[PDB]
């Protein structure tokens, strides 16, 4: 039970807190479905405090405290908790002013960012130097270390890969309490393990993130379909390799069920009421139970000719497509306004009291060969007759842009779809129904032989995690767990080794 000097110094300096206010704040997450109180919350003022805690953990025999690294707690099912353990309040690393926690490189080819930093601040500090990361998440108020522990995907991933494919190097403190810098060339085994590694191997204190010259504006389009075959064929055309890709900077898509079509179209924040009326009419003419929309952008800069060159490039692209004649809808915004588009959605929902609610989200990767089966079984099947609150996002990814040596698990096929069904619960009895429906969707997929992977989900059975990674890739994961977290204390809320 004796404490090392450096661990005791943290309690003395008021950094180790055991009060009910501190512990309660670190006991809930964005999922708002599960909770777990820690014994203590650490508020580090430097990476030395992290070394202190993890060295103590490693050297103290019989050490009982699991350790989690809370980013912004956007986890869905407790992945950032440490039940009866220590939660690290990562945000405390950026409390001061000296030194800065985000540094754009002198050559403008990368940005250095603290693990604790949120992507919105990474964006703001990048644009101040005329650059920006190439690969995003839909939502910018997430931490660098958090998204990198998962993958980080948005409409750019088809061409640039996920955020984990856009890291040059990291500083990481392992379960041993050892500060290690890692890359493809230095300590590559740790580098690959941590990326998509679900916080199992250590804490990312710094990430070196690839940037590109920052575009000024995004030409922003949505294309409407009643035929899934045409919708998916076009998403695949837009994202297909020609190493080289087509013009589009971003390609996502969405599914709208007929029952709430007008309301959901109106709630996109994209369509006007005039647009909505035309799409509702189209659905009725085609007798459609589902409507599909491709969402795409073309990034361009402040050049004088840029706007007309964009018009012509866009016109050419669209002429290769098969959306319903006349159902192309365009917007034109500043690039930062596009990237932070979901912030506005959060503000609106929270003011309605619809943000801090349970989020039984279903996120998965579905092989291209079975996407039409998934559409029939889920969008045209299971989901029909239900009231859906939250977007249903569907878009293809290219496996060639994913590094399978990293921890992140993906389907085997060259093309696979991100399917994100972002259900928001309107309290009882809606939550239990939504949890059951997600089970049924997974059940449908299992029975149809669809070889999907989950994303952002934590499994509670060993056989499920083994299947998740694949047996050979699982053994790799375990090898790296043994070297970097032998005491199995880190990120216990993933329920892999805890």
Ligand X SMILES: *[C@@H]1O[C@H](CO)[C@@H](O[C@@H]2O[C@H](CO)[C@@H](O)[C@H](O)[C@H]2NC(C)=O)[C@H](O)[C@H]1NC(C)=O
Ligand Y SMILES: *[C@@H]1O[C@H](CO)[C@@H](O)[C@H](O)[C@H]1NC(C)=O
- Which one of ligand FAD, ligand X, ligand MZO, none interacts with residue 30, CB within 5 to 8 A by kind? ligand FAD
CB atoms within 10 A of CB 61: 5
The residue from 185, 302, 429, 460 that contacts ligand Y (CB under 6 A) is 302
Q: Rule CB under 6 A: say whether 32 interacts with ligand Y.
A: yes
CB atoms within 10 A of CB 78: 23
Query: What binding mask, one character per residue, do residues 65-104 give for ligand X by CB under 6 A, x or -?
Result: ---------------------------------xxxx-x-
Q: Rule CB under 6 A: say whether 146 interacts with ligand X.
A: no
Q: Rule CB under 6 A: say whether 458 interacts with ligand X.
A: no
HSE of 136 in the Cβ direction (CA atoms, 13 Å)? 26
Q: Contact positions toward ligand FAD, by CB under 6 A?
A: 30, 68-75, 79-80, 90, 115, 137-139, 142-143, 145-147, 149-154, 198-199, 203-204, 456, 491, 493-494
The residue from 18, 20, 35, 320 that contacts ligand Y (CB under 6 A) is 35
Query: What binding mask, one character per residue, do residues 172-211 give for ligand X by CB under 6 A, x or -?
Result: ----------------------------------x-----
Q: Is-catalytic flag, 138?
A: yes
Q: Is-catalytic flag, 74?
A: yes
| Of residues 323 and 395, the one with the C-beta less far from ligand FAD | 395
138 annotated ligand binder = yes
* Cα–Cα separations (whole angstroms), residue 182 to 144, 169, 207, 351: 16, 6, 10, 43
- Which one of ligand Y, ligand FAD, ligand MZO, none interacts with residue 422, CB within 5 to 8 A by kind? ligand MZO
| Of residues 199 and 367, the one with the C-beta less far from ligand FAD | 199
Residues 6+ apart with CB under 8 A from 343: 120, 139, 140, 141
How far apart (Å, rounded) are the C-alpha atoms in residues 170 and 193? 12
Residues 6+ apart with CB under 8 A from 63: 56, 57, 487, 489
How far apart (Å, rounded) are the C-alpha atoms in residues 438 and 364? 11
| Of residues 44 and 391, the one with the C-beta less far from ligand MZO | 391
| Of residues 184 and 356, the one with the C-beta less far from ligand Y | 356
Query: What binding mask, one character per residue, do residues 276-315 give for ligand X by CB under 6 A, x or -?
Result: -----------x-x--------------------------
143 annotated ligand binder = yes
Q: Contact positions toward ligand MZO, by CB under 6 A?
A: 138-139, 153, 342, 345, 363, 391, 393, 418, 420, 422, 455
Q: Characterize 259-290 residue by residue with b for buried, 16 or more Cβ atoms within 10 angstroms of its Cβ, and e for exposed.
A: eebbebbebbebbeeebbebbeebbeeeebbb
The most distant pair of C-alpha atoms in the chain lies apart, rounded to whole Å, by: 75
Which of 44, 165, 50, 21 shows the shortest CA–CA distance to 94?
Answer: 44
- Which one of ligand Y, ligand FAD, ligand MZO, none interacts with residue 35, CB within 5 to 8 A by kind? ligand Y
- Which one of ligand X, ligand MZO, ligand Y, none interacts with residue 308, CB within 5 to 8 A by kind? none
Q: Rule CB under 6 A: say whether 216 interacts with ligand Y.
A: yes
- Which one of ligand X, ligand FAD, ligand Y, none interacts with residue 79, CB within 5 to 8 A by kind? ligand FAD
- Which one of ligand X, ligand MZO, ligand Y, none interacts with residue 243, CB within 5 to 8 A by kind? none
Q: Rule CB under 6 A: say whether 240 interacts with ligand Y.
A: no
CA–CA–CA angle 289, 295, 298 (5° rounding): 160
| Of residues 110 and 136, the one with the C-beta less far from ligand MZO | 136
Residues 6+ apart with CB under 8 A from 261: 279, 280, 283, 291
The least CB distance from residue 477 to ligand FAD, in Å, is 15
- Which one of ligand FAD, ligand MZO, ligand Y, none interacts with residue 73, CB within 5 to 8 A by kind? ligand FAD
How far apart (Å, rounded) are the C-alpha atoms in residues 200 and 472? 18
By the 8 A CB rule, do 495 and 69 touch?
A: no
By the 8 A CB rule, do 116 and 67 touch?
A: no
- DSSP, residue by residue, 308-356: HHHHHHHHHHHTT--SPTT-EEEEEEEHHHHHTHHHHHHHHHHHTT-SS
Backbone torsions φ then ψ of 67, nearest 5 degrees: -125, 125
Residues 6+ apart with CB under 8 A from 237: 246, 320, 321
- Any idea of the CA torsion for 373, 376, 379, 383, to the nearest 10 degrees? -110
Rg (CA), the chain: 23
By the 8 A CB rule, do 57 and 65 touch?
A: yes
Residue from 169, 252, 295, 485 carrying the catalytic annotation: 252
**Angle between helix 462-469 and 471-484 (nearest 10):** 110
Question: Residue positions in the annotated binding site for FAD?
Answer: 69, 71-73, 75, 79, 138, 143, 149, 153, 204, 455, 491, 494
What does the binding site for ligand X look like in residue numbers (CB under 6 A)?
A: 98-101, 103, 112, 114, 206, 258-259, 287, 289
Question: Residue positions in the annotated binding site for trans-zeatin?
Answer: 138, 345, 420
Question: Residue positions in the annotated binding site for N(6)-dimethylallyladenine?
Answer: 138, 345
Residues that are catalytic: 74, 138, 252
What does the binding site for ligand Y look like in residue numbers (CB under 6 A)?
A: 28, 32-35, 214, 216, 287, 289, 302, 356
């Amino acid at each position: 039970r004796p404490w090392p000097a450096s661990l005791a110094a943290l309690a003395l300096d008021g950094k180790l807190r055991t009060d009910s206010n501190a512990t309660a704040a670190a006991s809930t997450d964005f999922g708002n479905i599960t909770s777990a109180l820690p014994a203590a919350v650490l508020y580090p003022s430097s990476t030395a405090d992290l070394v202190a805690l993890l060295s103590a953990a490693n050297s103290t025999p019989g050490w009982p405290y699991t350790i989690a690294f809370r980013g912004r707690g956007h986890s869905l099912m407790g992945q950032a908790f440490a039940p009866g353990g220590v939660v690290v309040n990562m945000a405390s690393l950026g409390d001061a002013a000296a030194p800065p926690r985000i540094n754009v490189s002198a050559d403008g080819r990368y940005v250095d960012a603290g693990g604790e930093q949120v992507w919105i601040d990474v964006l703001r500090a990048s644009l101040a130097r005329g650059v920006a990361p190439r690969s995003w998440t839909d939502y910018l108020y997430l931490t660098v270390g958090g998204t990198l522990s998962n993958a980080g995907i948005s409409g750019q991933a088809f061409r640039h890969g996920p955020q984990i494919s856009n890291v040059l190097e990291m500083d990481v403190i392992t379960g041993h309490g050892e500060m290690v810098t890692c890359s493809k060339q230095l300590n590559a085994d740790l580098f690959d393990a941590v990326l998509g590694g679900l916080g199992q191997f250590g804490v990312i204190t710094r990430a070196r993130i690839a940037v590109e010259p920052a575009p000024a504006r995004a030409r922003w389009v949505r294309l409407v379909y009643t035929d899934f075959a045409a919708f998916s064929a076009d998403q695949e055309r837009l994202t297909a390799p020609r190493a080289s890709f087509g013009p589009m900077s971003y390609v996502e898509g969405s599914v709208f069920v007929n029952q709430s079509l007008a309301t959901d179209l109106a709630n996109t924040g994209f369509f006007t009421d005039a647009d909505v009326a035309r799409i509702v009419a189209l659905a009725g003419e085609r007798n459609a139970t589902t409507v599909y929309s491709i969402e795409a952008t073309l990034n361009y800069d402040n050049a004088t000719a840029a706007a007309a060159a964009v018009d012509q490039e866009l016109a050419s692209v669209l002429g290769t497509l098969s959306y319903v004649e006349g159902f192309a809808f365009q917007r034109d915004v500043a690039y930062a306004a596009f990237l932070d588009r979901v912030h506005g959605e959060e503000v609106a929902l929270n003011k309605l009291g619809l943000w801090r609610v349970p989020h039984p989200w279903l996120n998965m990767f579905v092989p291209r060969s079975r996407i039409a089966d998934f559409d029939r079984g889920v969008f045209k099947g299971i989901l029909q007759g239900t009231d859906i609150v939250g977007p249903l996002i569907v878009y293809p990814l290219n496996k060639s842009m994913w590094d399978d040596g990293m921890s992140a698990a993906t389907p085997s096929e060259d093309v696979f779809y991100a399917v994100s069904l972002l259900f928001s619960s309107v309290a009882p009895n809606d939550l239990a129904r939504l949890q059951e429906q997600n089970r049924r969707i997974l059940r449908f997929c299992d029975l149809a032989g669809i070889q999907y992977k989950t994303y952002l989900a934590r499994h509670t059975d060993r056989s499920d995690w083994v299947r998740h990674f694949g047996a050979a890739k699982w053994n790799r994961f375990v090898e790296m767990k043994n070297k970097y977290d032998p005491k199995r204390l880190l990120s216990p809320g993933q329920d892999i080794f805890n």
